[PDB]
Amino acid sequence: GEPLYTEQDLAVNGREGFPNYRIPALTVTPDGDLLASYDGRPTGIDAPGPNSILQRRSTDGGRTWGEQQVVSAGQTTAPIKGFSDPSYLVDRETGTIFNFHVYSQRQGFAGSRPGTDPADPNVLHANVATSTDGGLTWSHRTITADITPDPGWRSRFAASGEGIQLRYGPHAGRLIQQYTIINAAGAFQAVSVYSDDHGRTWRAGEAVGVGMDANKTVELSDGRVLLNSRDSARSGYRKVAVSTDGGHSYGPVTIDRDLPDPTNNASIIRAFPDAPAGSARAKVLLFSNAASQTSRSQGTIRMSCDDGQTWPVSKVFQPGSMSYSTLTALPDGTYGLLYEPGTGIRYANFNLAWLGGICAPFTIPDVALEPGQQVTVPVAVTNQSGIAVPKPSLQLDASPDWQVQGSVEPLMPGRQAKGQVTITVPAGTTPGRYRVGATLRTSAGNASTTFTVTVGLLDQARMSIADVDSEETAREDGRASNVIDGNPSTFWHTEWSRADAPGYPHRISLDLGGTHTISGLQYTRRQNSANEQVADYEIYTSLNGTTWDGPVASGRFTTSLAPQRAVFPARDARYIRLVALSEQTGHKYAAVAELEVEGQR
Numbered sequence: 001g002e003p004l005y006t007e008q009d010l011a012v013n014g015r016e017g018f019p020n021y022r023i024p025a026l027t028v029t030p031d032g033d034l035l036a037s038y039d040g041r042p043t044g045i046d047a048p049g050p051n052s053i054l055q056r057r058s059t060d061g062g063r064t065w066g067e068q069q070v071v072s073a074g075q076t077t078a079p080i081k082g083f084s085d086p087s088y089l090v091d092r093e094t095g096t097i098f099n100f101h102v103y104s105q106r107q108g109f110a111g112s113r114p115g116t117d118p119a120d121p122n123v124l125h126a127n128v129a130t131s132t133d134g135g136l137t138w139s140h141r142t143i144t145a146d147i148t149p150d151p152g153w154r155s156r157f158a159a160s161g162e163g164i165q166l167r168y169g170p171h172a173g174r175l176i177q178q179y180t181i182i183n184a185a186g187a188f189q190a191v192s193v194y195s196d197d198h199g200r201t202w203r204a205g206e207a208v209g210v211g212m213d214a215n216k217t218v219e220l221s222d223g224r225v226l227l228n229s230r231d232s233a234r235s236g237y238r239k240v241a242v243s244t245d246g247g248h249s250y251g252p253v254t255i256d257r258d259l260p261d262p263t264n265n266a267s268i269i270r271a272f273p274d275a276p277a278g279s280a281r282a283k284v285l286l287f288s289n290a291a292s293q294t295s296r297s298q299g300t301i302r303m304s305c306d307d308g309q310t311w312p313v314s315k316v317f318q319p320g321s322m323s324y325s326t327l328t329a330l331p332d333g334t335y336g337l338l339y340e341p342g343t344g345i346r347y348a349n350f351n352l353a354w355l356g357g358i359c360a361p362f363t364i365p366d367v368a369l370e371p372g373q374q375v376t377v378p379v380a381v382t383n384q385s386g387i388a389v390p391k392p393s394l395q396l397d398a399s400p401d402w403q404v405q406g407s408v409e410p411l412m413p414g415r416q417a418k419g420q421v422t423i424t425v426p427a428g429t430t431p432g433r434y435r436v437g438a439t440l441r442t443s444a445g446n447a448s449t450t451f452t453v454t455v456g457l458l459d460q461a462r463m464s465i466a467d468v469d470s471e472e473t474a475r476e477d478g479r480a481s482n483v484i485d486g487n488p489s490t491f492w493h494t495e496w497s498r499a500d501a502p503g504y505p506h507r508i509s510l511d512l513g514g515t516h517t518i519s520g521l522q523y524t525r526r527q528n529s530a531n532e533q534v535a536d537y538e539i540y541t542s543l544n545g546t547t548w549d550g551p552v553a554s555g556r557f558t559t560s561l562a563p564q565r566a567v568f569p570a571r572d573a574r575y576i577r578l579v580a581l582s583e584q585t586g587h588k589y590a591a592v593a594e595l596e597v598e599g600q601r
């Protein structure tokens with residue numbers, strides 16, 4: 001029915017006993033009682049500040065809230081004791097409550113020394129409070145010696161927010177809390193901690209990932225576990241993985257470019273946690289996070305109705321500052337959102353009608369073309385809503401001076417719809433990749449997708465590296481072929497891990513896959529570091545890749561994060577070469593996120 005958003009603080013900084021409140025946690029009890037947990041920070045810092053774990057209770061479904069009670073009390077007189085980064089987990093089968101948090105002594109996450117004795121003051125401990133009675137009374141234990149089977153795992157902390165219980169498959173019942181660890185080589189890794197015995201005993205799964213951090217899991221309509229992680233390598237995105245063995249082990253980790261993230265915690269839940277395995281409702285996920293690649297702001301809810309493959313629906317809940325957010329499914333059928341507005345801990349409620357979407361994701365393929373050209377690309381709407389909509393329309397958001405229109409057949413339940421998008425790119429459009437937004441506008445909700453229209457660039461897929469002067473592959477992935485992989489988040493980086501690596505000049509040559517009329521090169525700097533930016537440069541081209549004609553163009557790049565063009569009289573060529581002559585502030589290394597070649601396909 002009617003859209004609903006509502007919002008109210010639970011904690012403000014310098015009020016009710018602490019000068020700082022952070023790190024939100026939120027669950028629903030087998031009663032329907034809502035529990036909000038969070039850091040009370042005397043000295044305003046994460047571990048090892050002598051922090052407390054706090055909690056409040058709503059016995060009327062999120063309208064009103066009881067006293068600010070202490071679950072875990074920090075010791076601020078020496079020996080100091082810190083308890084921080086809270087995360088709930090309900091076992092709805094026994095109905096027991098867990099609340100995981102760190103127990104820190106002298107050392108934070110950074111300086112945690114290997115070992116697992118509770119008494120050791122240089123270990124950051126894994127703690128879990130236990131409550132068998134709805135979260136009123138609490139028992140306390142230290143589980144580090146159970147979840148460190150690799151001795152070089154020198155550090156750990158449970159991902160703040162809320163954890164899961166598997167409802168399906170051979171592992172049904174299993175409780176799963178996510179951790180981040182530090183291994184011997186000091187890489188940040190993701191790992192599930194689980195219990196097959198309702199909390200009695202806990203163990204660690206197989207560590208997966210590099211550049212990981214605070215991360216969450218959700219069980220999909222088929223019982224697979226989706227991991228969704230914070231990227232500590234600062235990609236601008238969420239990292240993702242999947243387990244087919246109930247959180248023991250995950251497959252390859254990828255950057256999820258559907259999911260821009262500023263290096264912040266995020267949350268991912270089942271919208272319908274009790275639905276049968278395999279059902280339409282069992283594929284529904286809500287995702288909350290800072291929807292900006294660069295700042296903790298524009299908090300955004302996304303809805304997936306296809307196990308998180310596609311994310312058709314999104315809506316901003318907070319324009320301004322928004323750090324950690326966590327979601328929880330309410331018994332009333334609405335949703336709890338506990339986030340960080342900046343003044344402490346806020347509690348928000350929304351319903352699915354607020355989100356304002358239609359479960360009907362659509363695909364419109366990427367298209368390549370020269371300027372002057374007209375092209376029809378099809379639309380395929382996968383109507384997952386199961387409802388009739390007489391007259392849907394397609395709004396497109398393309399460049400100001402393009403000729404664009406969208407169209408979509410009537411929307412029918414259970415069956416797909418067809419649509420079309422015609423595009424004319426006028427003569428004189430700047431060569432580039434154009435991200436065009438498409439919106440499906442309908443009576444019962446909107447869905448939207450993006451697709452790229454490449455204008456006068458050559459196909460990267462046909463390209464290869466012909467030569468590179470220098471590349472780092474030992475201590476990080478700085479392969480030259482990264483300039484032609486599509487991903488501004490992966491880069492070429494000249495060797496750095498050895499001291500005798502060359503400085504400038506640097507060189508990278510592309511083989512174009514064939515001979516093409518070419519007229520320019522677009523350079524994209526490395527996005528997450530500023531000391532390997534190319535300044536002075538020359539460009540060369542070749543037909544046979546050994547006789548080089550040039551410099552055909554020359555100049556100096558800016559510190560602009562966007563693609564920058566270097567243009568030259570059109571000419572046939574099978575190869576193009578970039579010579580980086582200098583760095584922006586004089587440094588040894590070059591990094592390049594992307595090279596595109598302006599030319600005729």
Ligand SMILES: OC[C@H]1O[C@@H](O)[C@H](O)[C@@H](O)[C@H]1O
Binds near residue numbers: 493496529532589
């Ligand atoms: O030695 C310089 C290196 O510094 C590292 O910290 C960085 O991750 C590398 O990309 C490289 O720039």
Ligand code: NA
Binds near residue numbers: 490594
């Ligand atoms: Na790249």
